[PDB]
Design a binder for this molecule. Structure first.
Ligand SMILES: CC(C)CCC[C@@H](C)[C@H]1CC[C@H]2[C@@H]3CC=C4C[C@@H](O)CC[C@]4(C)[C@H]3CC[C@]12C
Ligand SMILES: CC(C)CCC[C@@H](C)[C@H]1CC[C@H]2[C@@H]3CC=C4C[C@@H](O)CC[C@]4(C)[C@H]3CC[C@]12C
Ligand SMILES: CCCCCCCC/C=C\CCCCCCCC(=O)OC[C@H](O)CO
Lengths: 164, 164
């Protein structure tokens, strides 16, 4: 297969896998914890205590607004985009995918900037976040693919003549 | 004048007016104070004192990241967009305007949510700097509202207009 067809397969698996990541992990900061079983509640508690995540446990107002945007705007677009790139040749996904890419990239620039430069001392984060530079890379590692893959998607829909 | 050409003239002045607004006011939270004369530095303090803006006074990491994007991406795009909408028939601006609109519409959803839902008392990390009453919150939101609605008008205009 081609690099174009392979990238469409990758984008489909990215949009297909983003549905359980959002419903079962990300939305635990904006949706009540009662709706989640003790297994998933404690699984997110593992990531927060091991990766030293400051945002997921007690989301600030700016991070909660992005999680609601992920619920109302991104989650419905995931199955639509998954079908579009799994099937192939869906010219109608260009503008919707560009809007998703710029939106998602804009949400993670402040996320990556906070993890890399903000103060997580016993600050309004109250020592929840990372202290060392190595612990910050462990956190940026989980968040960075959700900026690069939309970046690839933005460049892919702007120039590909098969979607114009 | 028609409806489409009238909206293009309105969009031209919006991008033209944002060049001094970004330069002489917003970028004072990222650029050194010595790059600005004493007169302009008090003009921003006059705004922070009267409108009680907690973000432009001392920018948090998430708000400062959006300001760096306004310098590297938005500011170079303003003179290009003003010319294209003043001249008319510049179909090459469709995708760049969509990218600007979605990006600008994503930076303010956290801003608008923070100014209306977050606490700015002395018990918070803002240390008592910011709006207190609901009227003071809408008085500050009023300044940031046009920069979410005007891009939204631009987004819907670029998507459906057959001339672009
Ligand atoms: C135990 C394991 C599975 C925990 C996994 C943590 C990762 C996969 C979760 C936790 C925080 C989540 C992020 C929270 C916020 C956003 C911003 C949104 O606009 C894009 C998705 C994105 C970037 C989420 C991607 C998935 C994410 C990084
Ligand atoms: C005296 C009057 C005219 C002053 C007007 C101040 C207004 C126009 C300025 C002050 C604060 C500015 C905002 C500061 C931050 C950003 C985030 C950036 O990503 C988009 C532009 C945006 C949203 C600016 C829009 C213009 C803005 C709202
Ligand atoms: C967004 C992630 C960009 C790449 C991540 C690696 C960052 C490398 C150097 C930053 C130095 C930061 C200095 C403060 C500690």
């Amino acid at each position: 297969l081609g690099a174009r067809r392979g990238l469409e397969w990758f984008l489909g698996f990215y949009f297909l896998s983003h549905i359980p990541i959002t419903l079962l992990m990300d939305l635990q900061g904006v949706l009540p914890r009662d709706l989640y079983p003790v297994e998933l509640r404690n699984l997110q508690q593992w990531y927060i205590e091991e990766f030293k995540d400051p945002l997921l446990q007690t989301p600030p107002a700016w991070f909660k607004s992005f999680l609601f945007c992920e619920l109302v705007f991104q989650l419905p677009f995931f199955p639509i985009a998954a079908y579009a790139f799994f099937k192939g040749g869906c010219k109608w996904i260009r503008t919707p995918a560009i809007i998703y890419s710029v939106h998602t990239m804009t949400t993670l620039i402040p996320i990556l900037s906070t993890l890399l430069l903000d103060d997580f001392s016993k600050s309004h984060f109250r020592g929840q976040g990372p202290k060392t530079f190595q612990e910050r890379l462990f956190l940026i590692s989980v968040y960075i693919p959700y900026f690069l893959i939309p970046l690839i998607l933005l460049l892919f829909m702007v120039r590909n003549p098969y979607y114009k």
